[PDB]
Amino acid sequence: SHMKNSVSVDLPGSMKVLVSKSSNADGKYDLIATVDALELSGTSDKNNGSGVLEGVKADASKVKLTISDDLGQTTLEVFKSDGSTLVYKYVYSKDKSYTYEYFNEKGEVSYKYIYRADGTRLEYTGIKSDGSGKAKEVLKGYVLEGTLTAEKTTLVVKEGTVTLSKNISKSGEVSVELNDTDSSAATKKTAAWNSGTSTLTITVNSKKTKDLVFTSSNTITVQQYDSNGTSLEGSAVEITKLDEIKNALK
């Protein structure tokens, strides 16, 4: 793309926009960019690169790029020729976090990919009209699997008669629970969640055995209690594979 008497500005998602050095008789600035092979254009009351740019594809699809007033976010929408039914949509921030969505012929979401600033990911596949679907969380060393519903995301790990469930609410709040179908007092596992420290403490035969901590870095650590069940010993150790979570549930 080209523009007489202009300045190039770098944006989130490794995008670029050209903006005029000075305003026209109506006090406005001209904008131009090329995105995924198509030229978009617009005008703005501001001089920094922010505003709305639009274009139209060969197949009649309508494309719209919105650059936030402080340059911290970009949104790219592709609609049907009606200008309202979404085909796909993606959003980048200056910290490198990013979300991509695809839609069915009715304009309802069917797939969603989320990349967090720390490099971990959430992936939702086969999303239905009722809001349900398959869910996967991709961490450093291993992947967790489960389901999406209208209320929340639930990731599940099973070992023998024990089931561990990691819940994530609409707003990203994490809580964890454990249930064991074993009847014997000698071997049945139970647990207590502390929301104030993001920690699950496991008990067997009335005594504390270990602490599993669910950290702000999206990792899990394990640490054992002494043989009396009184104090933690050694140092906490970071989990690196799924089999090590299963080991902790034995």
Side-chain angles (χ1 to χ4, degrees), residues 126 186 201:
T201 301

Side-chain angles (χ1 to χ4, degrees), residues 137-152:
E137 190 175 27
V138 185
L139 294 322
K140 175 182 152 167
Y142 60 101
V143 307
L144 303 180
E145 305 200 26
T147 62
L148 168 72
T149 72
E151 296 296 345
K152 63 196 188 194

Side-chain angles (χ1 to χ4, degrees), residues 151-209:
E151 296 296 345
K152 63 196 188 194
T153 303
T154 304
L155 307 156
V156 176
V157 177
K158 287 178 172 98
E159 171 67 27
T161 49
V162 183
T163 305
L164 179 73
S165 303
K166 177 187 179 189
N167 298 295
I168 308 177
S169 74
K170 302 170 213 74
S171 47
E173 184 174 31
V174 171
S175 57
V176 181
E177 54 193 297
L178 180 152
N179 191 60
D180 191 348
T181 60
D182 190 352
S183 41
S184 178
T187 59
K188 179 191 176 86
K189 275 59 77 175
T190 54
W193 180 247
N194 184 355
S195 304
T197 56
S198 202
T199 302
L200 190 74
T201 301
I202 301 175
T203 294
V204 179
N205 193 31
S206 308
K207 296 167 62 169
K208 300 189 285 204
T209 63

Side-chain angles (χ1 to χ4, degrees), residues 61-231:
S61 279
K62 291 187 182 172
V63 182
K64 185 184 187 186
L65 170 62
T66 300
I67 300 153
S68 77
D69 284 7
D70 69 357
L71 316 176
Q73 183 182 97
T74 56
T75 301
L76 190 70
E77 292 164 307
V78 180
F79 306 97
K80 285 285 178 61
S81 53
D82 68 10
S84 308
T85 314
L86 281 171
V87 184
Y88 65 83
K89 180 184 178 189
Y90 65 87
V91 183
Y92 273 103
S93 303
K94 55 171 287 219
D95 67 12
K96 299 184 70 179
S97 63
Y98 162 82
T99 75
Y100 173 100
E101 290 163 297
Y102 210 91
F103 300 77
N104 66 21
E105 291 83 357
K106 286 182 279 161
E108 300 168 331
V109 191
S110 68
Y111 168 87
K112 186 173 183 171
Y113 166 95
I114 306 172
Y115 178 89
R116 307 188 178 118
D118 68 7
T120 59
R121 314 190 312 265
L122 279 165
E123 303 180 346
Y124 300 112
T125 59
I127 303 176
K128 303 176 173 316
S129 67
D130 66 14
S132 73
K134 303 298 185 297
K136 289 183 163 146
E137 190 175 27
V138 185
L139 294 322
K140 175 182 152 167
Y142 60 101
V143 307
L144 303 180
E145 305 200 26
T147 62
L148 168 72
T149 72
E151 296 296 345
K152 63 196 188 194
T153 303
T154 304
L155 307 156
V156 176
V157 177
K158 287 178 172 98
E159 171 67 27
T161 49
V162 183
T163 305
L164 179 73
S165 303
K166 177 187 179 189
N167 298 295
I168 308 177
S169 74
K170 302 170 213 74
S171 47
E173 184 174 31
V174 171
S175 57
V176 181
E177 54 193 297
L178 180 152
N179 191 60
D180 191 348
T181 60
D182 190 352
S183 41
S184 178
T187 59
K188 179 191 176 86
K189 275 59 77 175
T190 54
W193 180 247
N194 184 355
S195 304
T197 56
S198 202
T199 302
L200 190 74
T201 301
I202 301 175
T203 294
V204 179
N205 193 31
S206 308
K207 296 167 62 169
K208 300 189 285 204
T209 63
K210 65 199 74 189
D211 273 9
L212 286 167
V213 181
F214 295 74
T215 75
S216 67
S217 300
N218 300 124
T219 62
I220 307 171
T221 74
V222 66
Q223 195 176 6
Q224 318 293 318
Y225 290 82
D226 66 25
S227 50
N228 283 66
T230 302
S231 311

Side-chain angles (χ1 to χ4, degrees), residues 8-99:
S8 195
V9 184
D10 277 30
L11 300 171
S14 301
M15 280 174 249
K16 298 178 155 168
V17 67
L18 278 33
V19 61
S20 56
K21 287 195 256 199
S22 41
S23 62
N24 61 32
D26 304 284
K28 296 213 180 274
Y29 291 83
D30 293 302
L31 302 172
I32 208 271
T34 295
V35 180
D36 304 317
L38 187 75
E39 184 165 81
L40 314 176
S41 66
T43 64
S44 181
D45 288 338
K46 298 180 79 181
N47 56 245
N48 69 336
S50 57
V52 175
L53 296 82
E54 292 206 69
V56 299
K57 292 186 171 189
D59 60 1
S61 279
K62 291 187 182 172
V63 182
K64 185 184 187 186
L65 170 62
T66 300
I67 300 153
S68 77
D69 284 7
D70 69 357
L71 316 176
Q73 183 182 97
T74 56
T75 301
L76 190 70
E77 292 164 307
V78 180
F79 306 97
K80 285 285 178 61
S81 53
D82 68 10
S84 308
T85 314
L86 281 171
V87 184
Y88 65 83
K89 180 184 178 189
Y90 65 87
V91 183
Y92 273 103
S93 303
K94 55 171 287 219
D95 67 12
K96 299 184 70 179
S97 63
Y98 162 82
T99 75

